[PDB]
Symmetry: C4
Subunit: 374 residues, 4 copies
Amino acid sequence: MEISETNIGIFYVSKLLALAPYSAKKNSKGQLEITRSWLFSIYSVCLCLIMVFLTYRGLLFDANSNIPVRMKSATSKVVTASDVSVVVLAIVTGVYCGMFGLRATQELNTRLDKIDSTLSPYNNVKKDRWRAYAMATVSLIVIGILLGLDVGTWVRMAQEMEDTELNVQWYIPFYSLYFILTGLHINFANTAYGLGRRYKRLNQMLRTSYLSATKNKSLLIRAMADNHESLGKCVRLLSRFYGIAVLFILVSCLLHLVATAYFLFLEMLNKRDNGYVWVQMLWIIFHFLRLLMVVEPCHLAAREARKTIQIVCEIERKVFEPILVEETKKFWQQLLVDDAEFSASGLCRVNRTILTSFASAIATYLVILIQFQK
Amino acid sequence: MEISETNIGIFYVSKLLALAPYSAKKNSKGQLEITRSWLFSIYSVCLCLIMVFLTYRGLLFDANSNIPVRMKSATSKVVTASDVSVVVLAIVTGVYCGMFGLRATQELNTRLDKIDSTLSPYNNVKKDRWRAYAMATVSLIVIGILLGLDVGTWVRMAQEMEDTELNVQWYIPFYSLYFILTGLHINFANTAYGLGRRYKRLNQMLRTSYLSATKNKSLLIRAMADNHESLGKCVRLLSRFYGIAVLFILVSCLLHLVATAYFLFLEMLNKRDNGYVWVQMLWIIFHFLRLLMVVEPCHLAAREARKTIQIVCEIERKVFEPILVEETKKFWQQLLVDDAEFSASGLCRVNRTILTSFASAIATYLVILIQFQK
Amino acid sequence: MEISETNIGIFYVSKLLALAPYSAKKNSKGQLEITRSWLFSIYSVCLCLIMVFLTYRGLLFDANSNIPVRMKSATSKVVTASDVSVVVLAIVTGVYCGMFGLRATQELNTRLDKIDSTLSPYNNVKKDRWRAYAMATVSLIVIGILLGLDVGTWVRMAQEMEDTELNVQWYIPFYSLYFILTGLHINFANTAYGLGRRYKRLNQMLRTSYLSATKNKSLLIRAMADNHESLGKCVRLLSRFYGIAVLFILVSCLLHLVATAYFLFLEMLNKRDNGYVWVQMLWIIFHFLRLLMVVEPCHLAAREARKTIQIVCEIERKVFEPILVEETKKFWQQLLVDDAEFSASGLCRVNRTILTSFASAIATYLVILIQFQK
Amino acid sequence: MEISETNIGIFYVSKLLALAPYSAKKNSKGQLEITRSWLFSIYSVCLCLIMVFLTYRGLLFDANSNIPVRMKSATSKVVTASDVSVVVLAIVTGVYCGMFGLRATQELNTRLDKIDSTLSPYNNVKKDRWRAYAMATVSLIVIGILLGLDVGTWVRMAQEMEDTELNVQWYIPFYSLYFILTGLHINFANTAYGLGRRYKRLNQMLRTSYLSATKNKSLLIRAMADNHESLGKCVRLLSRFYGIAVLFILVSCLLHLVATAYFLFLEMLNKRDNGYVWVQMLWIIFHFLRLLMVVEPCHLAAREARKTIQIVCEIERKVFEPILVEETKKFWQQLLVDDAEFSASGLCRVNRTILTSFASAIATYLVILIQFQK
Ligand SMILES: OC[C@H]1O[C@](O)(CO)[C@@H](O)[C@@H]1O
Ligand SMILES: OC[C@H]1O[C@](O)(CO)[C@@H](O)[C@@H]1O
Ligand SMILES: OC[C@H]1O[C@](O)(CO)[C@@H](O)[C@@H]1O
Ligand SMILES: OC[C@H]1O[C@](O)(CO)[C@@H](O)[C@@H]1O
């Protein structure tokens, strides 16, 4: 995860949501330093364990309730349990990654500091801060009104048939855990989008400074080679930090994209109220947007990294000095060798192609289950 | 999309079908210039919106009609809605690509002009114009008689049980939108086939001029290197212009190849008239041909681009001059680096392998659905 | 397809089976010449058309017979029609490839002649002839007793309930077409195995002559580079000749591996005679062996082609002369560039990985269909 | 398989379990020599044949018993037969690989001896021996208590309804064969983990000795190039030795991960005793751990092999001598050329991506079968 004074609200939100128990303390030479927060580590572990235990306790309390609200069936129980358990797994993986990842975070931030140090000409900070804050605020607000609307529609259905108020607020830990899931998505989307933006700036350096004695050109070549190595290693560091968390996030998103669609189809077939149908449509849209927050930044970063050698050849021809050509040859050898694709801890490569495979899964399941219903 | 006086009827047809609101005006130095047509942009947006609203209005009017003609079932409604909605999505994506794509079209045509400028020896214009016009006319005619036959068979079935004339002409916007889909297929097939033909000419240059002082050979090497870069970038420009349109076209084609087959199987099982069965067989053949108009040109272009280094090695050995060998080394470095595969906006690579995967999908669905029917 | 005096019986059998209407006439300078046989081309087209029409006529005659023997059901009809039609498609594709492939065959044989010309030290002809003749004889004999056993078991079942003799010999064209399918498999297996054996000899040249003035070493380097180009181009020529025929062969083999397994499962569930069960087990084994006659030779050829640069590096280090090192550098550049994987006309790459995918299909279908039966 | 005095207990256990009929005899010059044990080869073949015949005899004896214990159904019979037969196939493949693999084992051990000879600085033997012995003991113990618990729960269920003691001990050969399967897993996990650890040491050599006259640096470069070749060839030797055994192990693991899950779901639906449910949960966990003993070591080895050129570039820049740079260029050419991914005899590449595909299979089957049950 990325820690910087460009956008420190994201780090504070992640720490609040028990996903980054860290401390951001400066020294005199700038260089924001990330240290382990022992007071916040125990807070994160306690909050994660308490929230998971609470949502599971509410889950089995609804299951054992006299009139169940959310899980009253042989199949509704299984699907609701799968949804809650996959959300719990995503939360636990995010907390585990944020806890035992201090060294990876420190190394990634140290590399990013040197990356930003030599990217001055197109280092526009205000726009980056505004974009990051807007993305975080929009994500938190959309999930806030989504959880509020979900509470409202479930309250409406429960009151349709202490009545049910405690039965429906038994899922408050579930929505609190959804909040932590949104925070984890915010963190990963910020880090990957920052890596992609730095790759864009790296591509821009060679695109404008060269395709427009002279040892400054050789210095720029060496600095950009170091920058491309640092970005390629930062992608690997991110894959070490949130690789399994992103895997479980993708699994949760696929499971939700299947289960919410199945619930919407069943509810439409039963010819019930329009509120639950609209809420499930909003949930499907939100799940699609959530999926377009992990595959999209990784795809952008990989595509921008791949677009460096294709411009490096241009300097390879548009050079005459015997030293700068050798330097560009080394850079070309790098880009022939380097590969900066995000990996979900080695199981899969996160990019837009997943969007196809997920569909190839969903269009399968939605073809099977529906045909079993009718 | 490609604009040239070699075949200007395709551009005029695309502009008529609300898919290319552009103006082709020359200057004195040849160089056909493509400008944004503000009068035609509003016409395109109005036609697209009106056509989509009209086909949807007819869709729900048939659904709410006293005796529905095309959608009278719980499953027929869903499948017909899926077909109409996927056609609508393809049309909307094509219009959106043709509207917000002026810069990409201008850059692609500017690059293609320089490509054709230095490909004189095998620049045969009359055959290219005849082939493009024949392909466009055949596509439009086949879809015309197909829509006419579909109107006829649906009229026959509707009259089998204002009677039904307004109910059956409620789908005239649907067939008008199918016409725009055919026009979009024509446009993409023309552009991709032109890129492939230029790749073939590029391969022919090095295949005949070298495998048969002398600085003309070095000049030809440099010109062909520039040509291969321009073609590789033109493939990327096309992937930027029609990348998502081709994705939605492939999705529509897969959905139709499944739905038309399911309808044919159901209709054969019900033992009804032979006209609808033959019309659906023709529709399946047309959908297969439509699929063999996006994967086929992209596959041809990629295969012809891949067949350049495999001939570049021949000059790499069949050269003696110290400068021409270095030039061929740079060209070889390009072809080792370059990749000219069309991408459907990053989700998938369009080639003949899709034909396999589509089958692996269809043979799945046609195995499931049929087993659910029997 | 490969024509040589090393094994001319395979070519004669292929010509007899309407799969190679060619003439093998020598000139004084050795160099067996393949010419188009106009007398045999019309024979091949007539035999193919007559056989296809005859098997289809018998198919619909059994379907319309008073007591059908092989197709008396709603599903048995469909599965039997699929089997017969896929066999017919394979036969038609093989005949079409053998007819409009004179130029490809001539070029492939011309390249193979030069390949064998400079592979003298390990050119062992008697073993190659014996292996090819044994493979062809074993394939023909196994299919002969398989068709005989199939005739016997179907006669037994038909007589269990002109009685049925004409109804059961209505499928004699089907088994005659199976004979042509076996001949096509023999042809492709001979050609691909010859390409693989020549790749093995090429790998052996560099493995023994170098890893054991001296311009003979440079001559050997140049000759082996030419040989590797000729083999890589011969693989492409074979992919042009039998690319679609191999695709339809793989489709037929997958369809048969599914259908025969489904029939065996159904017959075991019905608790009928053991003869049909054993015949279907033999048919499944034969279909598996048939599949291990297209993926196996292509996989062997690709694996042996890939094992050339991995030994080329050895000479790259074990050389001292400034000219031989440059020659080995060119050879290494080839093997870095070259790719000699057989392609089924671009849809898929034929290798052992298909064996996995086929299973991933079969284990799917055999899981679905069976669960639908019980 | 790896034979060394570092861990000789694994070899002795494998020989005892009829998976390595070899003899480890030293000569005076160290260099542990592996010879074929004719006394142990016949013992291995007899034990394998007797065990397979015994488990099959017990299988059909339970099937033909008056009151079947494990297979009393139309589907339970099929699933139990599939499990037992896939275990038998894995055992037979392991025995066949261990018998006809003397040359491959000898070559692999000879290469590994030279690998370990020049890896002295980080050659820590005590930790390697402790880790290997602990892994083997833990695997054997976990499978021992698992088979004991399985015997106990099956005895409990059988006594719930000579009573059944001989019927339940009719599966003692099945659990004895499971022991041999565990031994095969131990052998492959030891060999692949040793290859990965040697790759780690190779990566460490260049990571510490260079990234910290001088011909010792060139000597180290040459030695590490030879080491990387030897490791790449040792991976190929392992793929030759246990390639098909690992394929059948993966097939068995997938079949078990599906069948045990189906049994657990059915047993939970039937609302039976908790002991069988907990035993099946333990079996699922053990099968997952077994799967994380073939994909995990191969993935680690491939990932560590891929992390060599990415550090080789560092010496490529951090060198000044004209000879050491040329040596590093040759090493870079290797790592650009080399590929050290384990292959299951060419059908598939064993890595963590399989974990995804297996899930994509399981999540399919568990979606189908369950929907067929309800
Ligand atoms: O409660 C929120 C979660 O449960 C569902 O609403 C099920 O209807 C899912 O769509 C969503 O992920
Ligand atoms: O109306 C044309 C469209 O609707 C169908 O005819 C359904 O029968 C499809 O085959 C076709 O794509
Ligand atoms: O007639 C031979 C063909 O038909 C079947 O026997 C069906 O039982 C198939 O197994 C085989 O391919
Ligand atoms: O007997 C052990 C084997 O049989 C099962 O227990 C079936 O319940 C499997 O889980 C296991 O692989």
